[PDB]
Design an enzyme around this catalytic site. Structure first.
Site, PDB file in Angstrom:
ATOM      1  N   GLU A   1     -27.231  -2.668  23.310  1.00  0.00           N
ATOM      2  CA  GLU A   1     -26.893  -3.754  22.409  1.00  0.00           C
ATOM      3  C   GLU A   1     -26.103  -3.158  21.281  1.00  0.00           C
ATOM      4  O   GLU A   1     -26.542  -2.177  20.644  1.00  0.00           O
ATOM      5  CB  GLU A   1     -28.130  -4.440  21.885  1.00  0.00           C
ATOM      6  CG  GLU A   1     -29.065  -4.951  22.987  1.00  0.00           C
ATOM      7  CD  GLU A   1     -30.225  -5.766  22.445  1.00  0.00           C
ATOM      8  OE1 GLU A   1     -30.298  -5.933  21.205  1.00  0.00           O
ATOM      9  OE2 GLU A   1     -31.056  -6.259  23.253  1.00  0.00           O
TER      10      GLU A   1
ATOM     11  N   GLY B   1     -22.376  -7.689  20.861  1.00  0.00           N
ATOM     12  CA  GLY B   1     -22.876  -8.231  22.089  1.00  0.00           C
ATOM     13  C   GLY B   1     -23.619  -7.197  22.872  1.00  0.00           C
ATOM     14  O   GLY B   1     -23.776  -6.090  22.426  1.00  0.00           O
ATOM     15  N   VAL B   2     -24.083  -7.615  24.037  1.00  0.00           N
ATOM     16  CA  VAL B   2     -24.950  -6.845  24.965  1.00  0.00           C
ATOM     17  C   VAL B   2     -24.097  -6.097  26.001  1.00  0.00           C
ATOM     18  O   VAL B   2     -22.974  -6.521  26.354  1.00  0.00           O
ATOM     19  CB  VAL B   2     -25.954  -7.825  25.668  1.00  0.00           C
ATOM     20  CG1 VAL B   2     -25.193  -8.952  26.461  1.00  0.00           C
ATOM     21  CG2 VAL B   2     -26.899  -7.034  26.601  1.00  0.00           C
TER      22      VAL B   2
ATOM     23  N   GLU C   1     -15.521   2.217  31.435  1.00  0.00           N
ATOM     24  CA  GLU C   1     -16.122   3.180  32.336  1.00  0.00           C
ATOM     25  C   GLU C   1     -17.597   3.289  31.981  1.00  0.00           C
ATOM     26  O   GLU C   1     -18.003   3.067  30.837  1.00  0.00           O
ATOM     27  CB  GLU C   1     -15.441   4.551  32.187  1.00  0.00           C
ATOM     28  CG  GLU C   1     -15.564   5.087  30.793  1.00  0.00           C
ATOM     29  CD  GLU C   1     -14.973   6.499  30.648  1.00  0.00           C
ATOM     30  OE1 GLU C   1     -15.225   7.398  31.459  1.00  0.00           O
ATOM     31  OE2 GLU C   1     -14.221   6.685  29.718  1.00  0.00           O
TER      32      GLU C   1
ATOM     33  N   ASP D   1     -25.986   7.566  24.723  1.00  0.00           N
ATOM     34  CA  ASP D   1     -25.313   7.686  23.408  1.00  0.00           C
ATOM     35  C   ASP D   1     -25.801   8.922  22.625  1.00  0.00           C
ATOM     36  O   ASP D   1     -26.815   9.517  22.964  1.00  0.00           O
ATOM     37  CB  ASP D   1     -25.360   6.400  22.626  1.00  0.00           C
ATOM     38  CG  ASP D   1     -26.767   6.027  22.171  1.00  0.00           C
ATOM     39  OD1 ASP D   1     -27.303   6.590  21.214  1.00  0.00           O
ATOM     40  OD2 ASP D   1     -27.339   5.157  22.813  1.00  0.00           O
TER      41      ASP D   1
ATOM     42  N   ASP E   1     -16.041   1.911  12.113  1.00  0.00           N
ATOM     43  CA  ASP E   1     -17.506   1.849  12.167  1.00  0.00           C
ATOM     44  C   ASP E   1     -18.140   2.872  13.111  1.00  0.00           C
ATOM     45  O   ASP E   1     -18.966   2.540  13.929  1.00  0.00           O
ATOM     46  CB  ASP E   1     -17.967   0.425  12.531  1.00  0.00           C
ATOM     47  CG  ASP E   1     -19.440   0.138  12.150  1.00  0.00           C
ATOM     48  OD1 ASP E   1     -20.026   0.815  11.261  1.00  0.00           O
ATOM     49  OD2 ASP E   1     -20.011  -0.772  12.763  1.00  0.00           O
TER      50      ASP E   1
ATOM     51  N   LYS F   1     -20.550   5.650  14.449  1.00  0.00           N
ATOM     52  CA  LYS F   1     -21.960   5.939  14.271  1.00  0.00           C
ATOM     53  C   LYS F   1     -22.433   6.590  15.568  1.00  0.00           C
ATOM     54  O   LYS F   1     -21.787   6.435  16.576  1.00  0.00           O
ATOM     55  CB  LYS F   1     -22.747   4.663  14.016  1.00  0.00           C
ATOM     56  CG  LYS F   1     -22.673   3.613  15.151  1.00  0.00           C
ATOM     57  CD  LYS F   1     -23.217   2.261  14.738  1.00  0.00           C
ATOM     58  CE  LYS F   1     -22.249   1.513  13.906  1.00  0.00           C
ATOM     59  NZ  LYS F   1     -22.548   0.031  13.958  1.00  0.00           N
TER      60      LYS F   1
HETATM   61  C1  LIG Z   1     -17.433  -1.710  27.496  1.00  0.00           C
HETATM   62  C2  LIG Z   1     -18.839  -1.118  27.288  1.00  0.00           C
HETATM   63  C3  LIG Z   1     -19.020  -0.571  25.890  1.00  0.00           C
HETATM   64  O1  LIG Z   1     -18.528  -1.226  24.982  1.00  0.00           O
HETATM   65  N1  LIG Z   1     -19.670   0.567  25.593  1.00  0.00           N
HETATM   66  C4  LIG Z   1     -20.034   0.859  24.202  1.00  0.00           C
HETATM   67  C5  LIG Z   1     -21.456   0.331  24.115  1.00  0.00           C
HETATM   68  N2  LIG Z   1     -22.263   0.989  25.206  1.00  0.00           N
HETATM   69  C6  LIG Z   1     -23.716   0.904  25.181  1.00  0.00           C
HETATM   70  C7  LIG Z   1     -24.255   2.128  24.472  1.00  0.00           C
HETATM   71  C8  LIG Z   1     -21.684   1.629  26.334  1.00  0.00           C
HETATM   72  C9  LIG Z   1     -22.446   2.405  27.210  1.00  0.00           C
HETATM   73  C10 LIG Z   1     -21.850   3.024  28.319  1.00  0.00           C
HETATM   74  C11 LIG Z   1     -20.447   2.831  28.482  1.00  0.00           C
HETATM   75  C12 LIG Z   1     -19.635   2.036  27.647  1.00  0.00           C
HETATM   76  C13 LIG Z   1     -20.245   1.391  26.569  1.00  0.00           C
END
Ligand SMILES: *CCC(=O)N1CCN(CC)c2ccccc21
Length: 286
Positions: A11, A15-16, A73, A78, A119, A121
């Site tokens: 999240e 959005g999710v 991808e 994270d 932003d 982080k």
């Molecule tokens: C398009 C998907 C995306 O925006 N991201 C950033 C947010 N996250 C969740 C942590 C993410 C995880 C794996 C791959 C891309 C993305």
């Protein structure tokens, strides 16, 4: 029916994110769904061309049924989760150095195309098992604004926010992302957020208590910023030797340059990559 949900993976502010499978190609992707003049679709669509090994690949941008979908991808973790999982012993310094070197390359690329993140982080820096780290969510802050609360009513963190933003500057330069990255740098090294503010004033006073309250000498124009008050307490600057032990002298010199108050004096990504801190950079696998 174009993508199969596998599982929810996160999240963000807007959005999710789900791990999904592309029906027609078999590729596994990360699919972000955001609900809802507006130049957001144009600007975000332009990021499909802004490709770099240290920028999360934006595969597609889908606008349909008053929802915006971003297809990225798939990456597996994270930096915030990796830092939490490395809490007992810390991330090894050569890995920290590799990650900062790679993140600076990603910033230098976007900045060379005039694109700011605004932003950064740890939650939006994603790593794989091979030793790469990539910047996610380029463009979203500019397209939508940074709200006080996310779409799920969580507090948007202030911890990485540059002082010129907190003092109400109307113009943000690429320097705002260098500040944020220097905060992340110190956090990887010490295992604790550098400036964990819990309001805009607490964020500013934490910065001031470490770096000294800024004046016209270190930061020309600071006393005319919209949210500057002459009544700010006047704290003296701390020595970096206290702030980020046990970073060596090159890391401390670099970090101080990433944290200059004046956005005009703050080191650029391009210049940071030439810093002697990177003389011995390697690419370890975690
Ligand atoms: C398009 C998907 C995306 O925006 N991201 C950033 C947010 N996250 C969740 C942590 C993410 C995880 C794996 C791959 C891309 C993305």
């Amino acid at each position: 029916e174009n993508f199969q949900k596998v599982e929810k993976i996160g999240e963000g502010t807007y959005g999710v994110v789900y791990k999904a499978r592309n029906k027609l190609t078999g590729e596994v992707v990360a699919l972000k769904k955001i609900r809802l003049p507006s130049t957001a679709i144009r600007e975000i669509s332009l990021l499909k061309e802004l490709n770099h090994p240290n920028i999360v690949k934006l595969l597609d941008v889908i606008h349909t049924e008053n929802k915006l979908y971003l297809v990225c991808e798939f990456l597996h973790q994270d930096l915030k989760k990796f830092m939490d999982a490395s809490a007992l012993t810390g991330i090894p310094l050569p890995l920290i150095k590799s990650y900062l070197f790679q993140l600076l390359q990603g910033l230098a690329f976007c900045h060379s195309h005039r694109v700011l993140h605004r932003d950064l982080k740890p939650q939006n820096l994603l790593i794989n098992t091979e030793g790469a780290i990539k910047l996610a969510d380029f463009g979203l802050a500019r397209a939508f604004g940074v709200p006080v609360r996310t779409y799920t009513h969580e507090v948007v963190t202030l911890w990485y926010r540059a002082p010129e933003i907190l003092l109400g500057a109307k113009y943000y330069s690429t320097a705002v992302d260098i500040w944020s990255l220097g905060c992340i740098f110190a956090e990887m090294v010490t295992r604790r957020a550098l400036f964990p503010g819990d309001s805009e004033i607490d964020q500013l006073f934490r910065i001031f208590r470490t770096l000294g309250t800024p004046d016209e000498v270190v930061w020309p124009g600071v006393t005319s910023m919209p949210d500057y008050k002459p009544s700010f307490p006047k704290w003296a600057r701390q020595d970096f030797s206290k702030v980020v032990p046990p970073l060596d002298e090159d890391g401390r010199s670099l970090l101080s340059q990433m944290l200059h108050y004046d956005p005009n004096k703050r080191i650029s990504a391009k210049a940071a990559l030439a810093h002697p801190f990177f003389q011995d950079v390697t690419k370890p696998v975690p």
